[PDB]
Amino acid sequence: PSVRQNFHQDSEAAINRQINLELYASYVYLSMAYYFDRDDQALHNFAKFFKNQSHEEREHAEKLMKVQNQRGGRIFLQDIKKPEKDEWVSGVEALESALQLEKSVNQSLLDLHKVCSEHNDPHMCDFIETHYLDEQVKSIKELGDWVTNLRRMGAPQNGMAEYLFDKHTLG
Amino acid sequence: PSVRQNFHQDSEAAINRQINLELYASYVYLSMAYYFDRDDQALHNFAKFFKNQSHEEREHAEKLMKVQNQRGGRIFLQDIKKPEKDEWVSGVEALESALQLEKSVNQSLLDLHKVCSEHNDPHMCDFIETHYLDEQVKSIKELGDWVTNLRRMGAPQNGMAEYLFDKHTLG
Amino acid sequence: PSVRQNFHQDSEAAINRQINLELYASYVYLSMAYYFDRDDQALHNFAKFFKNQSHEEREHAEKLMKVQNQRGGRIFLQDIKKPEKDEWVSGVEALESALQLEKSVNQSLLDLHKVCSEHNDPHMCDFIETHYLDEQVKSIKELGDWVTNLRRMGAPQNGMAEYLFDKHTLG
Amino acid sequence: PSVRQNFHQDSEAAINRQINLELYASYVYLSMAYYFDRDDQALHNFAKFFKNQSHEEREHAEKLMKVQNQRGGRIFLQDIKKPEKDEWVSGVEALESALQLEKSVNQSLLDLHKVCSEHNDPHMCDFIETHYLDEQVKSIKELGDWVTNLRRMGAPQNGMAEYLFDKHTLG
Amino acid sequence: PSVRQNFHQDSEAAINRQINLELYASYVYLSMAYYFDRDDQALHNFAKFFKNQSHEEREHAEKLMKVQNQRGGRIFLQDIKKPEKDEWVSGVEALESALQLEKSVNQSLLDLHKVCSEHNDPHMCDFIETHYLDEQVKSIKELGDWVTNLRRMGAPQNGMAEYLFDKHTLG
Amino acid sequence: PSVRQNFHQDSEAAINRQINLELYASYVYLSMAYYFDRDDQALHNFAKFFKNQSHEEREHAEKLMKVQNQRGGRIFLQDIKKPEKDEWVSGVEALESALQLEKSVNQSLLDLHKVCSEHNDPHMCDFIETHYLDEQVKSIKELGDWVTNLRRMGAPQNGMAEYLFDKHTLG
Ligand SMILES: [Fe+3]
Ligand SMILES: [Fe+3]
Ligand SMILES: [Fe+3]
Ligand SMILES: [Fe+3]
Ligand SMILES: [Fe+3]
Ligand SMILES: [Fe+3]
């Protein structure tokens, strides 16, 4: 591509991996959203939070697709794997699962940053710094905050805990 | 589920298939969108059309996920398969590929309607009629309209055809 | 200077080189702008694009002049060399020339980043990342997009191509 | 902490040092503010500038306290040492003292950046770049500008110099 | 100072002690604020209350610095001692600690009033009465109210107590 | 060119010389602007005046480029020579240097008018009269006014002179 400059095939390949992972995260969140939409779960603010997380992960993916094209890389999409579970058990356990997902995505972003840093690609390094790393830190901190509150309230055994958390923190 | 009533396992299973197909269509459209975002394609109104189609297919999927829960069915997600191509060749050829996709989705919707009709599920039949069948017919007609105009202008060999179509019809 | 801190003479010297290069780019763009203002060219939206690029390159230069003073460096201006051509031949060929200019400026910015990175000057590295690197990537991608469209339309031999591109993309 | 990821104890410890230093700077500025509030000094725009600097340094500290918690570090506060002087002698001499303070804070920030850079913590590196390094450069440049103007006017011996500077530059 | 009138060195010295104590209180509150900002505490309305208390104590200090200068006294700042704890254990226990702090500050204010009263300084006596004594009484009463409610709800053992108190009373 | 009429090659050549001179003046003013932006000069209203003069000289150049094309002449750009100095010593001395520059530009404009007048080109004569000659006279008078005020105040030896002039006349 006549636009390609200082853009290594390792960086290009790692961006394609990150694209698939962000789409994967979007899919996990979509699953969690409609799990709490079930009539036997019915925590609709949990559902709404997870649904919005799904749309945001989808935007995360598209911005990587955009920068791949901007730099002259070539997008190669892969299957979006179905999530590990069909049922997420409880509100606090879904959030704990989400925390592990965000930490895995974060580690993959840090690995992506290392690849671009090794190939002296400061455009990509700051693109990741600007658009992903602090977003990830904030998302992880928030999930940690929420898991702490839920567990301290006795969730999931305390049947009032996730109901009230859904009303107060998630509204 | 205590909400489940007049809802057959065949209908439930066919809804889960339709959910995956709508997500698949969303993924095909996402691929087409960023294909025309490439610096060696650069038909950004084609890209914008396909990007919006992707978001709409995603909404189509979520509404089926919603009605599955409303009726007491249980959502089972599957892998979202990557599209058949990585490159869609040209604007007119992508639209012709999109036309075949919409017709496949339409046939799967008609097959879904037949299943629900066989099990005398009028709620599901009218849900499909109201929210999907006319949308599908309109989408197919529109793609047919556009392919006709592009081919009559000589696309893709006429290099001016997709450029002007992108400016006039897709703006 | 009592403000100077962690600011190496290599970085200072490379900033002065970048200042002259940005001014040079401004001058090339000014030349291209009034070339298409000629009565025997008369692509006034090409002219207007290039004129605005010239003013923007001038701002790029002034921001480097500002950061040189902020860090306690000392500005040393050099001749602004006249462009390589007096005539840019055609709209598509001027844009292809502009693409090569932006890539040269981009490489000089990346070289500047490497100098500041070697001397562990994170203020300058992020100043370049924040204000120049993504701007450069976007400018290169845009020029690539436009050259692709023009050449696919047959420019410059197709006399309708640059006229219509001037009306649709450059208006 | 379940949020902690890629966060080294050296970085954590250096953040705690920076927190105390920013609070220290806030305290120095508070001292300078009410020094010029004295009836035998009575340069109230100097006082107002220094008072606002004190509040800003306090915000600088709190943002480091925030990022320490975001990353799962643990805040350890230390005594805020009283400033080196009780009396700052004159407007120009206080600003010269402030310049040395900002340069010391700047060097501690650069040392903090080096620690995080050594441990490949790009989140912290860009957090420092985004929120502190350019702020520091601008603050140092401004103090340098002002000291130059005051000394050229003959401050503090010229009794009119700090009075007029207080009215024109500090209003 | 030519402004000094009816202003005893004992009063001056006691004002300097009160200044340091108000700054100390500000520092204790800052510590409490970011303690509940921890991911393993995450009572953000507790954090926000304590953060605002910290800013208010800082204003309390500055108003004493102002009246010291107004009367011709001379400000002598001392170290701001770090708080007694790094961790405040729980919401109710932090508020109980805050109650003891406010009572200590209140007793120091009453001792300050006695000094000024002994030296027949009615300006200072009414300055303390107007700006500090009723503020202190209201702050103590409020903390007492809140501790009563928390303990009656079973805090900290009842994991729901501080969560709901944070939502209802502290929002 | 089919638009060329009553337009002599001497006039055309002299316009190209004037274009380069106006760009040269723009460059001198840019140098002066960031000279007073130095931390050891820091007369920011001098800097702002000179910066605006630079942009205006650039407009002067572009209007000559425009009229060259309007008349069917052909623009030939030359190197923009760096200014004679890197440092302009003081505010009053920079303005005295600017005065000599404006007088040189004025003489070149008068010489240009004589060329066009000799070739009986009344369009060009009135274009110069309308757009340049009175602007030049006003700019020279203003610089003369300012140098008179600065020198009468004792600039540059009187350190208060340029500071106050920067605040009163240049704000
Ligand atoms: Fe993400
Ligand atoms: Fe669909
Ligand atoms: Fe540039
Ligand atoms: Fe600071
Ligand atoms: Fe207080
Ligand atoms: Fe001029």
C129, C112 in Cβ contact below 8 A?
no
The answer for residues whose C-beta is within 8 angstroms of residue E134's C-beta and 6 or more apart is none
Enumerate helices (H) and strands (E) in chain B, giving the number of each.
6, 0
Burial class (CB in 10 A: 0-12, 13-18, 19+), B9: exposed
Two structure tokens written together for B56: 């709409």
Is residue C155 within 8 A of residue C103, CB to CB? The reply is no
Q: How near does any CA of chain B get to the CA of A82, in Å? A: 5
DSSP conformational letter for A38: S
**Secondary structure (DSSP) of A120-169:** T-HHHHHHHIIIIIHHHHHHHHHHHHHHHHHHHTTTTTSHHHHHHHHHHT
Q: Does D1 contact F at CB distance below 8 Å?
A: no
d(CA B36, nearest CA chain C) in Å? 10
Ligand 3: centre distance to CA C149 (Å): 24
**What is the C-alpha end-to-end distance of chain A, expressed in Å?**
48
DSSP string, E35-53: HHTSTTT--HHHHHHHHHH
Residue contact C2–F81, C-beta within 8 A: no
How far apart CA F88 and CA F78 sit, in angstroms, is 25
User: Within its chain, how far is the Cα of F146 from the centroid?
Assistant: 16
Distant-in-sequence, close-in-space partners of E107: CB < 8 Å, separation ≥ 6: none
Distance of CA F124 to the CA centre of its chain: 19
E3: which 2 tokens? 């402004």
> What angle, 0 to 180 degrees and rounded to 10, lies between the N-to-C axes of helices D134-152 and D159-168?
140
**Chain B residues touching A15 at Cβ < 8 A:** none
The shortest C-alpha distance from D112 to chain A (Å) reads 17
Which chain E residues are within 8 Å of D81, Cβ to Cβ?
79
Interface test mutation site (partner C, options A3, A8, A15, max chain C beta carbons within 10 A): A3
C77: left (phi over 0), alpha (psi -120 to 50) or beta: beta
Q: What is the DSSP letter of B80?
A: B
H or E segment and range at residue E84: none
Pair D132, D60: CB distance under 8 Å? yes
Q: Cα–Cα distance between B34 and B24 in angstroms, integer?
A: 16
Structural domains in chain B, sorted by start: 9-169 (1.20.1260.10)
Using CB atoms, list chains with 3+ pairs below 8 Å to chain A: B, C, D, E
Six-digit token pair at B35?
């294909």
Q: How was this structure determined?
A: X-ray
Residues 6+ apart with CB under 8 A from B136: B102, B105, B106, B109
Report the alpha-carbon distance of residue E140 to residue E132 in Å, rounded.
12
Q: Which amino acid is at C152?
A: R
E120: left (phi over 0), alpha (psi -120 to 50) or beta: left
Taking the C-alpha atoms of residue C22 and residue F67, their distance in angstroms, rounded to an integer, is: 27
Residue with tokens 């954090």: E47
**How many Å lie between the alpha carbon of A117 and the closest alpha carbon of chain B?**
25
Instruction: Classify burial at F59, counting beta carbons within 10 Å of its beta carbon; exposed 0-12, middle 13-18, buried 19 or more.
Output: exposed
The per-residue DSSP string of B105-148 comes to HHHHHHHHHHHHHHTT-HHHHHHHIIIIIHHHHHHHHHHHHHHH
CB contact A146 to E (< 8 Å): yes
Show Cβ contacts of residue B41 under 8 Å, excluding neighbours closer than 6 positions: B35, C148
Question: Measured at the alpha carbon of residue E127, what is the angle toward residues E121 and E129, in degrees to the nearest 5?
Answer: 100
The region, left, alpha or beta by phi > 0 then psi within -120 to 50, assigned to residue C72 is left
Query: A99: which 2 tokens?
Result: 């925390």
Chain C hits for D107, Cβ within 8 Å: 5-6
Cα–Cα nearest to D141, from D96, D90, D105, D99: D99
Q: Are F46 and F36 in contact (CB under 8 A)?
A: yes
Nearest ligand by distance to the CA of E106: 5
**B138 CB burial (10 A radius; 0-12, 13-18, 19+):** exposed
Give the N- to C-terminal CA distance of chain B in Å, as an integer.
48
Residues in chain A: 171
CB contact under 8 A, D3 and A140: yes
In degrees, rounded to 5, the angle at the alpha carbon of residue D168 between the alpha carbons of residues D166 and D170 is 50
Question: For residue E26, which of E51, E63, E1, E4 has the smallest C-alpha distance?
Answer: E51
Contact (CB, 8 A) for F34 and F13: no
* Facing residue for D154 by CB, picked from F39, F44, F159: F159
Expressed in angstroms and rounded, the spacing between residue D24 Cα and the centre of ligand 5 is 20
What secondary structure letter does DSSP report for E81?
Answer: P
Instruction: In whole angstroms, give the CA distance from residue F171 to residue F151.
Output: 19
Cα separation of D19 and B49, whole Å?
50
Where would I find the H helices in chain F? 9-36, 44-70, 91-118, 122-128, 134-152, 159-168
Using the Cβ of D42 and the Cβ atoms of chain E, whether some distance falls under 8 Å is answered with no
Q: For residue C28, which ligand has an atom nearest its CA?
A: 3
Helix (H) or strand (E) holding D66: helix D44-70
Nearest to D161 by CA among D92, D94, D96: D92
Whether residue E156 has a cis bond before it, omega within 30° of 0: yes
Strand partners of residue B170: none
Closest CA to C124 of A122, D33, E38, E56: A122
- Helix ranges (H only) for C37-158 are 44-70, 91-118, 122-128, 134-152
Query: Do F68 and F20 form a contact (C-beta atoms < 8 A)?
Result: no
Question: Residue D137: closest CA among chain F residues belongs to which residue?
Answer: F39
The CA distance from A6 to the nearest CA of chain E, in Å, is 40
For the record, the structure tokens of F83 come out as 């200014």
CB-based contact (8 Å) between E56 and chain D? no
Residues of D in contact with C2 (CB under 8 A): 99, 144, 147
For residue B64, give the nearest of B29, B23, B30, B18 by alpha carbon.
B18
CB nearest to D5's CB, from A106, A117, A134: A106
CA separation for the pair C115, C119 (Å, rounded): 6
CA distances from F28 to F57, F64, F106 (A): 10, 19, 15
Provide the β-strand partners of residue A80.
B80
Q: How far is the CA of D158 from the centre of ligand 3 (A)?
A: 46
How distant, in Å, are the alpha carbons of A89, B31, C151, C168 from that of C145? 49, 18, 10, 14
Q: Which residues surround ligand 2, an ion (CB under 5 A)?
A: B 22, 57, 60
Q: Helices B9-36 and A44-70 sit at what angle, rounded to 10 degrees?
A: 30
Residues of C in contact with F86 (CB under 8 A): 74-77
Name the burial class of residue B156, with classes exposed (0-12), middle (13-18) and buried (19+) by CB atoms within 10 angstroms of its CB. Answer: middle
List of chains touching D (3+ CB pairs within 8 A): A, C, E, F
* Centre of ligand 1 from the C-alpha of residue B51, in Å: 19
Cis peptide before B122 (omega within 30 of 0): no
Q: How far is CA E9 from CA B118, E2, E13, E17, E64, in A?
A: 99, 15, 6, 12, 15
Minimal Cα–Cα distance from C29 to chain F, Å?
A: 12
Angle at the Cα of F69 from the Cα atoms of F67 and F71, rounded to 5 degrees:
70
Helix (H) or strand (E) run with residue B171 in it: none
Q: How far is the CA of B110 from the centre of ligand 2 (A)?
A: 12
Instruction: Find the CB nearest E42 among A145, A160, A161.
Output: A145
Q: Which residues make beta-bridge pairs with F80?
A: C80
| Dihedral of the alpha carbons of A123, A124, A128, A131, in degrees to the nearest 10 | 50
Touching C (3+ Cβ pairs <8 A), the chains are A, B, D, F
Q: Closest by alpha carbon to F116, among F20, F24, F18, F21? A: F18
Do residues D67 and D19 touch, judged by C-beta distance below 8 A?
Answer: no
DSSP for A71-129, written as a single string: TT-------BPPPS-S---SHHHHHHHHHHHHHHHHHHHHHHHHHHHHTT-HHHHHHHI
Whole-angstrom distance, CA of residue E106 vs CA of residue E104? 5
Cα B56 to Cα C52: distance, rounded to the nearest angstrom: 38
Residue B157 forms contact with A (CB below 8 Å): no
**Among B87, B86, B85, B90, CA closest to B46:** B90
User: Is B82's CB within 8 Å of A78's CB?
Assistant: yes
By CB atoms closer than 10 A (0-12, 13-18, 19+), residue C131 is middle
Please identify which residue in the block is written with the tokens 């019809």: B169
Q: Specify the length of chain F in residues.
A: 171
How far does the centroid of ligand 1 lie from the alpha carbon of residue A58, in Å? 8
Rounded CA separation C88/C109 (Å)? 25
Q: Which of E114, E15, E27 is nearest to E66 (CA)?
A: E15
Cα-only R_g, chain F: 18
What six digits make up the tokens of A125? 């390094």
In one-letter notation, the amino acid at residue B140 is I
Task: Print burial letters for B56-87: b (CB count within 10 Å at least 16), e (below 16).
Answer: bbbebbbebbebbbebbbebbbbebbbbeeee
State the sign of the Cα–Cα–Cα–Cα dihedral C78, C79, C85, C91.
positive
CB contacts, 8 Å: B51 with chain A: 62
**Residue E2 CA neighbour count, 13 Å, CB half:** 3
Residue D123: how many CA atoms within 13 Å on its side-chain side? 24
F48 neighbors F93 (Cβ within 8 angstroms): no
Whether a cis peptide bond, with omega within 30° of 0, leads into A156 is yes
Indicate which of B37, B39, B92 best probes the interface with C, i.e. most C CBs within 10 Å of its own CB: B39
User: Reduced to 3 states, what is the DSSP secondary structure of residue D80?
Assistant: strand
Amino acid at C145: D
Q: Assess D31–E contact: CB distance below 8 Å, yes or no.
A: yes
Nearest ligand to the CA atom of E20: 5
Q: Which residues contact D56 (CB under 8 A, 6 or more apart)?
A: none
Chain F residues touching D150 at Cβ < 8 A: none
Cis peptide before E83 (omega within 30 of 0): no
Residue D139, Cα to own-chain centre: how many angstroms?
8
CA distance B78 to B23: 10
The helix/strand/coil state of F80 is strand
Region of D13 (left: φ > 0; alpha: ψ -120 to 50; beta: rest) is: alpha
Taking the C-alpha atoms of residue A37 and residue A39, their distance in angstroms, rounded to an integer, is 6
User: What distance in Å separates the CA atoms of residue B74 and residue E111, rounded to the nearest whole number?
Assistant: 71
Phi, psi torsion values for D80, nearest 5 degrees: -95, 105
Selection from D154, D20, D153 nearest residue D80 by Cα? D20
Tokens of E165: 């108190």
- How far D123 CA sits from the closest chain A CA (Å)? 6
CA A75/CA A72 separation, integer angstroms: 10
Q: Mention every residue, 6+ apart, whose C-beta is less than 8 A from residue F103.
A: F140
Whole-angstrom distance, CA of residue F96 vs CA of residue D144: 27
What is the Å distance from ligand 4's center to D22 Cα? Answer: 5
- Give CA–CA dist F70/F65, Å, rounded: 9
d(CA F36, CA F94): 10
Residues in Cβ contact with B78 at an 8 Å cutoff, skipping those fewer than 6 apart:
A82, B16, B20
Chain F contact for D160 (CB, 8 A cutoff):
yes
**What are the phi and psi torsion angles at E80 (to 5°)?**
-95, 105
CB pair distance less than 8 Å for F42 and D146 = yes
Cα C117 from Cα C10, distance rounded (Å): 11
Q: Is the dihedral of CA E141, E144, E150, E151 positive or negative?
A: negative
Q: Do E163 and A146 touch (CB under 8 A)?
A: no
Residues in chain D closer than 8 A to A133 (CB atoms):
122-123, 126
- Contacts of the segment A46-55: beta carbons below 8 A, 24+ positions apart: A46/A91, A46/A94, A46/A162, A46/A166, A46/A170, A48/A170, A49/A170, A50/A94, A50/A98, A51/B62, A53/A29, A53/A98, A54/A26, A54/A27, A54/A29, A54/A30, A55/A26
User: Among residues A152, B160, A41, F37, which one has the least CA distance to residue C165?
Assistant: B160
CB distance from D69 to chain E under 8 Å? yes
| CA B98/CA A129 separation, integer angstroms | 36
Helix (H) or strand (E) holding E167, with range, is: helix E159-168
Share in percent of chain E as helix, strand, coil (round to 5): 75, 0, 25
Contact E82 D83 (CB under 8 A): no
